Amino acid sequence: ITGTSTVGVGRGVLGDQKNINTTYSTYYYLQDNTRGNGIFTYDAKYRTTLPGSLWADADNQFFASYDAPAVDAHYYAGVTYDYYKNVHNRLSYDGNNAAIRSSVHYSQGYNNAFWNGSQMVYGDGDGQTFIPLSGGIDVVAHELTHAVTDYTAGLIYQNESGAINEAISDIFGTLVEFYANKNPDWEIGEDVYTPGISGDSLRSMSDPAKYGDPDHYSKRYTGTQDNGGVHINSGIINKAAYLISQGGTHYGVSVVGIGRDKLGKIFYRALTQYLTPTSNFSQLRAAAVQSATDLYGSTSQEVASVKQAFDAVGVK
Numbered sequence: 001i002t003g004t005s006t007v008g009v010g011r012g013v014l015g016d017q018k019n020i021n022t023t024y025s026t027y028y029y030l031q032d033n034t035r036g037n038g039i040f041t042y043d044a045k046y047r048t049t050l051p052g053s054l055w056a057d058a059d060n061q062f063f064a065s066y067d068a069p070a071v072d073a074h075y076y077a078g079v080t081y082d083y084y085k086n087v088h089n090r091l092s093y094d095g096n097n098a099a100i101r102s103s104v105h106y107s108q109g110y111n112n113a114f115w116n117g118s119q120m121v122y123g124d125g126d127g128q129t130f131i132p133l134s135g136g137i138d139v140v141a142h143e144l145t146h147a148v149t150d151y152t153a154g155l156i157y158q159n160e161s162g163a164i165n166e167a168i169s170d171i172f173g174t175l176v177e178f179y180a181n182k183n184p185d186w187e188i189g190e191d192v193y194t195p196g197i198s199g200d201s202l203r204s205m206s207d208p209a210k211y212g213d214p215d216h217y218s219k220r221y222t223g224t225q226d227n228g229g230v231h232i233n234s235g236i237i238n239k240a241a242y243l244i245s246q247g248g249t250h251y252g253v254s255v256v257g258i259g260r261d262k263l264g265k266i267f268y269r270a271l272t273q274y275l276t277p278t279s280n281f282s283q284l285r286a287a288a289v290q291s292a293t294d295l296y297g298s299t300s301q302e303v304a305s306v307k308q309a310f311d312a313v314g315v316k
């Protein structure tokens with residue numbers, strides 16, 4: 001909408017108060033004019049028609065329980081934008097300040113979220129398996145990272161290319177969670193998953209096997225479900241990324257950790273300069289080794305640790 005940039009206040013899904021950038025024209029809309037061509041948040045109103053209505057509020061205060069998912073989708077889209085701009089000099093998901101659009105209250109009791117090619121979409125969950133999924137900063141950043149991948153590598157969403165696509169979204173979702181520095185970890189979706197159970201999540205990058213996902217190539221899923229295992233085989237790559245950052249000994253192979261910033265630089269370089277739509281795990285190792293070589297030198301610790309981590313997960 002055309003209007004005046006304003007700043008509202010509300011509470012997110014987990015009851016945290018935060019300020020949000022809004023636009024005033026009769027109503028206050030969830031439209032942040034301060035980031036690129038805008039961040040826009042919509043109400044799907046329990047239906048599956050997208051995007052739905054640009055979120056409008058009478059008084060610029062967003063404290064209703066119904067508001068909470070909208071507050072978080074809008075706020076965390078902004079944090080993710082900040083991460084890509086400040087850390088990688090990338091302006092929105094296309095690198096050209098594309099408007100970022102999110103819809104909440106998608107369907108009834110919908111236990112998922114997704115990038116649909118155009119925008120991010122968040123279910124409210126059924127209150128048992130999930131609370132509203134925009135409450136998870138790693139979730140929001142995972143989904144917006146699919147947009148980044150769409151505009152860069154374009155990894156096809158099936159088999160090994162799809163598992164890489166999935167891992168890239170887990171890696172940057174997690175790096176954004178660390179950037180924001182609120183209860184960061186190497187797990188995915190812990191903030192919104194199972195409000196009745198402490199300490200669980202959808203996936204673990206540090207120990208994928210904790211939730212039944214492979215941590216070595218020898219254990220890859222070869223079946224047809226989940227598009228050839230894209231959320232399962234991502235464990236292999238996530239494990240490699242965790243090792244490059246944090247280090248450790250995995251199946252008797254030792255990796256010296258080089259830290260999250262360098263992990264981020266190496267995978268962002270691989271994503272934007274070397275990976276293709278059909279890149280497999282072997283080609284990802286090559287891309288990451290070449291990216292570390294470009295940044296640090298063929299004989300650097302960084303290159304060595306990338307090699308070590310891929311060796312540890314059985315990827316040559």
Ligand SMILES: N[C@@H](Cc1ccc(O)cc1)C(=O)O
Nearest residue numbers: 110111112113129202226231
């Ligand atoms: N996002 C993942 C994990 C997931 C699976 C089922 C859900 O109901 C929610 C999340 C997927 O779509 O496979």
Ligand SMILES: [Ca+2]
Nearest residue numbers: 057059061062
């Ligand atoms: Ca209000």
Ligand SMILES: [Ca+2]
Nearest residue numbers: 183184185190
């Ligand atoms: Ca966390």
Ligand SMILES: [Ca+2]
Nearest residue numbers: 138187188189
């Ligand atoms: Ca997390």
Ligand SMILES: [Ca+2]
Nearest residue numbers: 193194195197
């Ligand atoms: Ca839980």
Ligand SMILES: [Zn+2]
Nearest residue numbers: 142146166169
């Ligand atoms: Zn995903």
